[PDB]
Amino acid sequence: KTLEVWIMPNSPQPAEDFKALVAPFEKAHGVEVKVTVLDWGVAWTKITTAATSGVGPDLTQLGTTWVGAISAMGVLEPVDDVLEALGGEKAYLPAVWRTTRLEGARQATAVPWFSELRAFYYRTDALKAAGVNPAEMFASWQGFEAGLARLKASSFRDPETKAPLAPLCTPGRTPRTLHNAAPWIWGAGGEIVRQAGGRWQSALNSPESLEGLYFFLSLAQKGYVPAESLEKNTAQIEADFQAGKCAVFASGPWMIQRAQVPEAKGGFAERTAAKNLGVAPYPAGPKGRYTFFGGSNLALFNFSKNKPLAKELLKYLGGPEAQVRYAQMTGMLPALRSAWSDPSFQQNPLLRTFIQAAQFGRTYPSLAGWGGVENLAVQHLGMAWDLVAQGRLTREALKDLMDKASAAINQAL
Ligand SMILES: OC[C@H]1O[C@@H](O[C@@H]2[C@@H](O)[C@H](O[C@@H]3[C@@H](O)[C@H](O)O[C@H](CO)[C@H]3O)O[C@H](CO)[C@H]2O)[C@H](O)[C@@H](O)[C@@H]1O
Numbered sequence: 001k002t003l004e005v006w007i008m009p010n011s012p013q014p015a016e017d018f019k020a021l022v023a024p025f026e027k028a029h030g031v032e033v034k035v036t037v038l039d040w041g042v043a044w045t046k047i048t049t050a051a052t053s054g055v056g057p058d059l060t061q062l063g064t065t066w067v068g069a070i071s072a073m074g075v076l077e078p079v080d081d082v083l084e085a086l087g088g089e090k091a092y093l094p095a096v097w098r099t100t101r102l103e104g105a106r107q108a109t110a111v112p113w114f115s116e117l118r119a120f121y122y123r124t125d126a127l128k129a130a131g132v133n134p135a136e137m138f139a140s141w142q143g144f145e146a147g148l149a150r151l152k153a154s155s156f157r158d159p160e161t162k163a164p165l166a167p168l169c170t171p172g173r174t175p176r177t178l179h180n181a182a183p184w185i186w187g188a189g190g191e192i193v194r195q196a197g198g199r200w201q202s203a204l205n206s207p208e209s210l211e212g213l214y215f216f217l218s219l220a221q222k223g224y225v226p227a228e229s230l231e232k233n234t235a236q237i238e239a240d241f242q243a244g245k246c247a248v249f250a251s252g253p254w255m256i257q258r259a260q261v262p263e264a265k266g267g268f269a270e271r272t273a274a275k276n277l278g279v280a281p282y283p284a285g286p287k288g289r290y291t292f293f294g295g296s297n298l299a300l301f302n303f304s305k306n307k308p309l310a311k312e313l314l315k316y317l318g319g320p321e322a323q324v325r326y327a328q329m330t331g332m333l334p335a336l337r338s339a340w341s342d343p344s345f346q347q348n349p350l351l352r353t354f355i356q357a358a359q360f361g362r363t364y365p366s367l368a369g370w371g372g373v374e375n376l377a378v379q380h381l382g383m384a385w386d387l388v389a390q391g392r393l394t395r396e397a398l399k400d401l402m403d404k405a406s407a408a409i410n411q412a413l
């Protein structure tokens with residue numbers, strides 16, 4: 001018998017790493033495990049096409065936020081037996097457990113594979129030279145703005161580029177998701193959707209959510225984000241941080257591993273940023289401190305010919321040995337709570353900060369219509385970034401854009 005698994009590029013050699021991870025399972029169950037690697041760019045499409053055609057792999061990886069959508073199409077096997085077999089609900093963070101099913105469904109459709117959440121990477125050299133205490137800059141919004149002001153003013157020059165560093169690199173194209181903006185919405189006491197008397201509605205136009213977005217977008221108006229960044233996406237900003245063009249930017253724990261690996265295998269060990277890398281959690285806003293908590297689950301398609309064998313593989317990948325090994329190869333965090341206690345995570349100081357940030361990780365409701373709701377949100381936010389490009393953003397103009405987003409989102413639900 002043979003299994004097919006579809007994954008995303010979770011590690012630098014993503015196929016090789018997965019083949020090594022499941023070698024003991026291949027040997028132990030006497031089976032070959034064919035893996036196919038989909039860019040995040042087109043994974044939504046390949047997976048959805050397998051769901052409607054009823055042709056594809058036994059297992060697929062899923063972004064946490066996609067489980068509701070795929071579940072609702074009626075193409076996923078229940079996996080209660082696999083979750084029970086791994087310790088059930090108590091074995092996982094509640095922000096991870098939320099993403100095992102369609103919101104409000106009897107049965108689980110996804111087994112948690114790994115987690116990732118966002119924190120600030122910073123240049124320890126740049127902050128030291130501007131006399132900014134990282135604990136102070138990342139403690140509060142007031143601290144954050146004050147650090148960027150000191151960072152804008154500093155004479156410091158990257159020793160490779162001999163040029164300044166821009167204080168903050170954040171993208172301001174159309175976002176593809178609200179991963180970058182959600183923490184500011186949450187930090188201010190806001191949220192994207194509110195569950196009121198059974199149905200969900202937009203909360204993007206609440207006073208608290210508009211104070212969060214406007215704080216985030218206002219950092220660009222105050223010139224802590226350079227013009228050219230308002231034309232870039234997350235990948236090109238990662239390049240800019242790695243290349244010594246900016247002091248601070250938000251990403252997931254993969255950059256820690258990327259810093260120990262040389263330029264010629266997708267890493268940045270050779271760069272000044274790699275020998276001067278700090279990490280801090282999102283600053284606390286008025287109503288507290290939050291980051292985007294996501295990652296990926298594995299799902300079994302209900303048309304698989306190899307269901308027994310494929311649930312065995314799910315028990316394996318979802319369980320303690322495989323959870324530790326995959327996390328070392330990817331730089332992600334294990335989805336299984338137990339497996340965080342491994343020495344290999346406790347002795348990396350930068351990873352400790354992401355492990356701590358997990359307590360303030362927030363996720364989205366696992367909704368059939370989530371992707372639609374995020375598209376309306378980011379399309380309207382994108383027109384607020386256009387106002388920033390022009391130096392014309394106001395609280396009024398942002399309220400008006402989020403009111404149109406809200407009216408569309410209430411409809412979509
Ligand atoms: O919104 C869909 C889905 O997004 C997922 O977040 C991913 C990021 O994790 C991913 O980041 C890449 C790393 O996973 C990869 O290993 O390294 C590269 C570069 O070294 C990173 O870009 O990037 C994609 C966009 O390219 C994001 O979608 C979330 O985990 C999940 O919660 C969500 O459902």
Ligand SMILES: [Cl-]
Nearest residue numbers: 175178180181
């Ligand atoms: Cl954004």
